[PDB]
Design a protein around this ligand. Structure first.
Ligand SMILES: Nc1ncnc2c1ncn2[C@@H]1O[C@H](COP(=O)(O)OP(=O)(O)OP(O)(O)=S)[C@@H](O)[C@H]1O
Ligand SMILES: [Mg+2]
Length: 408
């Protein structure tokens, strides 16, 4: 009846509730392999099979529909779309095509697309692409974040005020709390602004840390693992950013929580050839600069906001040079010191140097004069002790009267 079901359903409910259709031996069949053998048996005799996925136009002329569940990996369970179907409808990589599918004829090998119900959560009626929309400022609306899973969200709203559509960069050494900071920020998105679309992207990630991430975040989670080829990392990032573009064309506010822009740039460097000072090829950091460069604040309606992690102190010469490039391109900085976290103080934020560009119109009027002086009294603090001056007064009330009573 549906494809959105079979791809996500338990892996063993296919040999229990699908084998009873009369199949030979599903001993060593991959997840997507069996789903193909079930659809190519359910549809053969009078049915109404639905189908959905995200479009990826290849190079020749056609483009398949890929599963967001499989991190956009390609298998037998992909819906084929004819070049002629990319003609009548103005199709661009990143479109969510939902419609009635059909079994292969004789030699097609890929389930083809027939009827097209909704193109990007809407009937085929087309508008203004991202490359045409004006880009005035990151600051229009703000996304603000005495419990426990709010104490790190508290210093986030004080150090680096996030905006509804903003280029964000988190600079953190390994083991400072970055892979756990994203699952902290993502939590406070569906707990404050559930209207926003959420996509978490993890490039060159650890397998067991992917599962922890997807079973904790309220939204879409796509990732690549450190065993997958350099070309694979490119695809997932090329799929997420192109899809998020299609939604922003539809006035929708999208947020991307990218992890490892360095490991993403390290991927592009490996694929894009052709002049390499510091390990990285000079004419290669163009592609990852474009990814991060898309995060804007559309005037015509919409919001693209990427907050990516720029890894430092990896030891590798390459990862060091990648940050040197992005240093100031983003208009939001959130540092994590590997000395505050060293002494088991884990909200390890270098508050002193974590400001945002043009934060004057990102907040309420009566908020700046206190925020600056609140830092002017934290300027001569330091490292470990600095995160003890703004954690004790923070442990009391919410955010407002945090510095009201105690001001001797
Ligand atoms: N918000 C937080 N609250 C409490 N503890 C935290 C927080 N963030 C990080 N930590 C602690 O700091 C450690 C950091 O581990 P992770 O959550 O994996 O972060 P990480 O810096 O990305 O680690 P790596 O470099 O990927 S192995 C964990 O053992 C946590 O106990
Ligand atoms: Mg990690």
């Amino acid at each position: 009846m549906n494809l959105t079901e079979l791809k996500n359903t338990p892996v063993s409910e296919l040999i229990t509730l699908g084998e009873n259709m009369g199949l030979e031996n599903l001993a060593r069949m991959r997840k997507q392999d069996i789903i193909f053998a079930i659809l190519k048996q359910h549809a053969k005799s009078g049915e109404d099979i639905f189908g959905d996925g995200v479009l990826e136009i290849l190079q020749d002329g056609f483009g398949f529909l890929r599963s967001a569940d499989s991190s956009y990996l390609a298998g037998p369970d992909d819906i084929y779309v004819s070049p002629s179907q990319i003609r009548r409808f103005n199709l661009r990589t990143g479109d969510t095509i939902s419609g009635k599918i059909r079994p292969p004829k004789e030699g097609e090998r890929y389930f083809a697309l027939l009827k097209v119900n909704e193109v990007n959560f809407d009937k085929p009626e087309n508008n203004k692409i991202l490359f045409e929309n004006l880009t005035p400022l990151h600051a229009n609306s703000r996304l603000r974040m005495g419990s426990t899973e709010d104490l790190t969200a508290r210093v986030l709203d004080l150090a680096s005020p996030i905006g509804r559509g903003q280029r964000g960069l988190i600079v953190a050494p390994p083991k400072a709390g970055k892979t756990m900071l994203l699952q902290n920020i993502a939590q406070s998105i569906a707990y404050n602004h559930p209207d926003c679309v959420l996509m978490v992207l993890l490039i060159d990630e650890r397998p067991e840390e992917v599962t922890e991430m997807q079973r904790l975040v309220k939204g879409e989670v796509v990732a690549s693992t450190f065993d997958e080829p350099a070309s694979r990392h490119v695809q997932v990032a090329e799929m997420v950013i192109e899809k998020a573009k299609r939604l922003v064309e539809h006035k929708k506010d999208v947020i991307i929580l990218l992890d490892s822009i360095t490991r993403l740039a390290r991927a592009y460097n490996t694929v894009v050839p052709a002049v390499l000072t510091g390990g990285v090829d000079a004419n290669a950091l163009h592609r990852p600069k474009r990814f991060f460069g898309a995060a804007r604040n559309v005037e015509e309606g919409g919001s693209l906001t990427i907050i990516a992690t720029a890894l430092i102190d990896t030891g590798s010469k390459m990862d060091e040079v990648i940050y040197e490039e992005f240093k100031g391109t983003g208009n939001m900085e959130l540092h994590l010191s590997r000395k505050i976290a060293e002494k088991r103080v884990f909200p390890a934020i270098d508050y002193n140097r974590s400001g945002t560009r043009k934060e004057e119109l990102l907040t309420t009027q009566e908020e700046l004069q206190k925020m600056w002086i609140l830092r002017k009294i934290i300027h001569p603090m330091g490292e470990i002790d600095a995160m003890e001056f703004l954690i004790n007064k923070l442990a009391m009330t919410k955010t407002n009267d945090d510095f009201f009573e105690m001001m001797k």
